[PDB]
Amino acid sequence: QTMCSQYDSASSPPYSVNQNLWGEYQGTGSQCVYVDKLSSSGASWHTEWTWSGGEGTVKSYSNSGVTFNKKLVSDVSSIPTSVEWKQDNTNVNADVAYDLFTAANVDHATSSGDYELMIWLARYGNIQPIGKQIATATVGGKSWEVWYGSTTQAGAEQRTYSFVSESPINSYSGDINAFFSYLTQNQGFPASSQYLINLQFGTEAFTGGPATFTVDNWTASVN
């Protein structure tokens, strides 16, 4: 499947590959997502993009996602995931990251939440997470810079926690629940009153290109 319009999705329950150019009007360029292999066991895809203008603003977040029974973070047993990706052309402003949202209302829209947990496997150019660094933590046998900041739009505030690796991690696997556990015990995260409502992985593109982001394989589950 080749997807080049603003919003498109291809799915094979529980996996999906999504073209999402939500910040398209902030600049000039083009981007398509190509499904390489999509089945109930995992997703393989790539995206080629070129964006100019609106420096510092995200133009898109093409990604692969997984559907699951939404539940309280405190009730989550494990969130196993694995991925292998590659970036062709690093002279760009972009990041490679997992994006998870939680909300006090299980019926909350999945495009945002009360809290957002981001796990950056790579950072390119001059971009940086929202807020400021508040710690460095060891999660899953790896060291991460812990960033925290908030944003407000249309009357709703979103608190974002970002775990950033020092250098690119192209092959990664682990239990994402370990990050929630850290937040619950070390940053007062309200795990017993927040529902996990979305889990995605992809690349946020700001400016630069032509560039190609490739996901050789991606798996994820919420138990």
The closest of 87, 96, 111 to 163, measured between CA atoms, is: 96
Catalytic choice (24, 48, 145, 204): 204
Catalytic choice (24, 48, 116, 145): 116
The residue type found at 149 is G
Helix/strand/coil for 26: helix
- Assess contact for 32 and 58: CB atoms under 8 A: no
The closest of 165, 182, 180, 173 to 220, measured between CA atoms, is: 173
**Sign of torsion over alpha carbons 174, 142, 87, 101:** positive
- Assess contact for 149 and 131: CB atoms under 8 A: yes
Dihedral, CA atoms, 201, 79, 103, 192, nearest 10 degrees? Answer: -160
Resolution reading in Å: 2.1
**Rounded to whole angstroms, how far apart are CA atoms 118 and 161?**
6
- Map out the domains of the chain with their CATH numbers: 1-223 (2.60.120.180)
116 catalytic? Reply is: yes
Relative to beta strand 7-12, strand 2-3 is: unpaired
**Phi and psi based region of residue 184 (left: phi greater than 0; alpha: psi -120 to 50; beta: remaining):** alpha
Relative to beta strand 71-72, strand 195-220 is: antiparallel
H-run or E-run covering 177 = helix 177-186
User: For the chain, first and last CA: distance in Å?
Assistant: 29
Residues 6 or more apart whose CB falls under 8 angstroms from that of 118 comprise 97, 98, 99, 100, 129, 160, 161, 162, 163
Name 17's bridge partners: 10, 64
The residue type found at 102 is T
